Design a protein around this ligand. Structure first.
Ligand SMILES: C[Si](C)(O[Si](C)(C)c1coc2ccc(C(=O)N3CCC(c4cccc(CN)c4)CC3)cc12)c1coc2ccc(C(=O)N3CCC(c4cccc(CN)c4)CC3)cc12
Ligand SMILES: C[Si](C)(O[Si](C)(C)c1coc2ccc(C(=O)N3CCC(c4cccc(CN)c4)CC3)cc12)c1coc2ccc(C(=O)N3CCC(c4cccc(CN)c4)CC3)cc12
Ligand SMILES: [Cl-]
Ligand SMILES: [Cl-]
Ligand SMILES: [Cl-]
Ligand SMILES: [Cl-]
Lengths: 243, 243, 243, 243
């Protein structure tokens, strides 16, 4: 997270951390608890090439990474079959937990938006994670969960910004219709935040609008953060996750 | 270049090296001389973002990098407007030199293929360059130009390989129709070879079939190297370079 | 620490961590609390060149680095004037804290040895710290304090080992008389453990025999760890620290 | 070499490069041809631990490293038996070549000084090598041999300078009697120049005064380059090398 601060312990009860087996169970990507037995994340965290399930675990909301880990095994990785790279799109994946989590006020699910939900330009949303704090700047120990408030950007404007200072033809889409943009040169998600949630409070209810997907660096001029648009893939999500 | 060997001095008179300004004028991609005032390279080497032309120079065929440099400045960088990433396609670009080069038996242009040549499996083709000699292994000093003979794999077969060990659906195309596949687990191009030539001997004449573009690593199982298919982009090239 | 295990919370109440200011207050050496206002460490951790005192802080016994830091600033750095490198000797230094620490069962001083204790082979001795767990392997998060029991090797025997596989003449002393050897190819201190304590239980009391100083790598054949012999430097220490 | 320039091809016919076996025969240290069958170098380049002779070769004077290598095998490494580290001293070694070199005006021996030779403070001398061009700045390709003119410094002054900004007692020697100092904040030897020659023209004859040994960084305030004093070790040298 670039330009944020450390999150209050009471906030973001759905945030998860994805961990890969090595010398330790290291954080590589974020995710969100969308049902007691399912995590929503980015396909590029876990694909497109097939991964060993035994080398992956999930960690539920933690103030500080690694300090009080209680690692959860995963029973299935479901990567959207249209995914090959984040720039092409379909950057979305599900992880089915081995058990349902017992929900509490401290760890619980996020609400998905209705199909019709339009998160309008300017709407204040929040992105969270334990990613880098700037380009090539790691989150320092003790690895607090960070948050930053970022406004939704309209696709057409976000696409136009990506074309400024580029050779790419103006009518050739960079930011595609299954993607959503947020952030500026002071506030953004960054590497390690991938797969985590962009959430917006709509009439007082928190809805997950996006999944951290990609961008050109973090907080760079004319290069807002790009997210997979959750509304776009609701039907695919609902094919596996109970409503 | 993975596999193969140091090129004889008499071969590949069209090979160029692209250099970026820093503590020294460092090699970062290859290219080919297609006209005395024009170099053909990969878009990903010089885009999609606009770079400072003053910080780019070209070196004509050299047996060893850096030893006998005579760097040439560039007046224009022209990048295919469809280009955004190598995995999407249109990985092709042109550099106009500030002056025409004087040609000779040692340094001269390569012939572009007619629109109809398809470069089928079994054709004798070579890829050349100063890139890495295996995944994450640098070409050692004194940096000789390398060459390797690479076998063509038909696009549909190549695409099908790219789907083995992938989540990507089998009918979601990975290797696109403007690309070409060649190489195996002993013979391939690698990082630093990008933008250079794949040339095939057709009826006694060397034609440039491909521009080194991408792949999943270098010389990995089921993952041939991918080239930009030059025939696909002949009309574009001819918008800029005289016939 | 190579080998051994995470220390129980009740053990080594004297262990400290030295921190250098940067993107975070990073652990770079250990130390020991020898008086409420004084820490004993290795000279090589803080010298021979004079450093900015404002950029140094000390953390008292913590089970996990960084998680619950309460950093304490330093008023004086006193380095043995014979010191230039660890291989020459006099690898010993004192830090005066700006305030006295409040002691308890969890955090308190270690007892210095009488001038006459020699710490012979067979004595039960432990070395503790947050350093590397093998040559060039970092202690992973969450950075637990480690301990390992290390066997003492008599100085002359240790010196003779240091000469095996060396050009150095056998009568040119390597392990000097102000040093002490301990450890083997399974149990040793390592980088990041420097400046911390080697403690040996003598007649029911824990005494600090050694300060972690140097060695040829960590847990390597014929190369025990080398410590600064605390008894050699008692008079110096007592020039500064009250009895 | 810090602050130098590329050497004329006619200069320094005694300079050699020491090469270690890996992915290529990489330069690690300098040396000097002091007899047709012997190279003078620093012991820290090849010790104090015993090295495999088969993994070492010598390269005679070359304008550019790696370009025209003709690598020479070594038949004996002789490391001064008093050597353990450069800061202690005796940082001097001999390599006996498998054959005598055939001398020419382009490659030939350097003259050693007489025992009595005093290279006085201020005398202009030259150091040469293919080392780093500043702290942590590698010599760029095509790796030219560099030179820089450096004045001799008196030991007592050099020792005093090393004490400025240090905790080390003023009467505790840092720069020892077998060492010689030269250089300033604009001109110095650096890592990779080790073992190469410091040469001074005395009444029109070039004599080797020093062997590049160590220092605190390169070209740092109050930290001149330190060399092994060749006069000090003449008798040891003459024990193996014919006069
Ligand atoms: C994940 Si990749 C490594 O991405 Si790119 C550097 C190619 C990339 C393409 O578009 C981009 C657009 C942006 C960024 C970028 O700036 N990022 C940093 C910031 C980050 C980020 C993350 C989270 C949030 C935010 C928002 N602020 C940003 C997103 C990535 C990176 C990119 C990649 C995608 O598909 C691939 C397919 C293959 C490979 C691959 O294996 N290689 C590349 C090709 C190479 C090769 C070279 C020559 C010849 C051959 C033939 N043998 C091979 C071998 C190694 C790599 C990839
Ligand atoms: C200890 Si240092 C960093 O030197 Si060494 C790595 C060659 C060393 C000398 O003896 C040793 C003996 C052992 C080890 C070693 O193996 N270690 C790894 C393990 C570690 C350790 C730590 C804790 C516990 C244990 C026990 N298991 C071990 C101790 C170090 C290392 C060494 C050193 C001491 O005094 C110095 C003074 C100066 C410098 C220094 O600044 N430089 C070296 C010289 C160099 C230079 C080169 C050519 C010309 C010039 C002139 N401009 C300069 C510039 C950079 C470095 C040092
Ligand atoms: Cl919340
Ligand atoms: Cl040819
Ligand atoms: Cl204890
Ligand atoms: Cl000369």
């Amino acid at each position: 997270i670039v330009g944020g601060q450390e999150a209050p312990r009471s906030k973001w009860p759905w945030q998860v951390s994805l961990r890969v087996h090595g010398p330790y169970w290291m954080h590589f990507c974020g995710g969100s608890l969308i049902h007691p037995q399912w995590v929503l994340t980015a396909a590029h965290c876990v694909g497109p090439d097939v991964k060993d399930l035994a080398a992956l675990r999930v960690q539920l909301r933690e103030q500080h990474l690694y300090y009080q880990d209680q690692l959860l095994p995963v029973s299935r990785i479901i990567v959207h079959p249209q995914f090959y790279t984040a720039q092409i799109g379909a950057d979305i994946a599900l992880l089915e937990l081995e058990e349902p989590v017992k929900v509490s006020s401290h760890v619980h699910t996020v609400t998905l938006p209705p199909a019709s939900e339009t998160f309008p330009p300017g709407m204040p949303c929040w992105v969270t994670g334990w990613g880098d704090v700037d380009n090539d700047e790691r989150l320092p120990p003790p690895f607090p969960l960070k948050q930053v408030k970022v406004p939704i950007m309209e696709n057409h404007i976000c696409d136009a910004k990506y074309h400024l200072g580029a050779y790419t033809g103006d009518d050739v889409r960079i930011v595609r219709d299954d993607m959503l943009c947020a952030g500026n040169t002071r506030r953004d998600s960054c590497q390690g935040d991938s797969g985590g949630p962009l959430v917006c409070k709509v009439n007082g209810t928190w809805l997950q609008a996006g999944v951290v997907s990609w961008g050109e660096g973090c907080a760079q001029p004319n290069r807002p953060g790009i997210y997979t648009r959750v509304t776009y893939y609701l039907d695919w999500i609902h094919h596996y996750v109970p409503k």
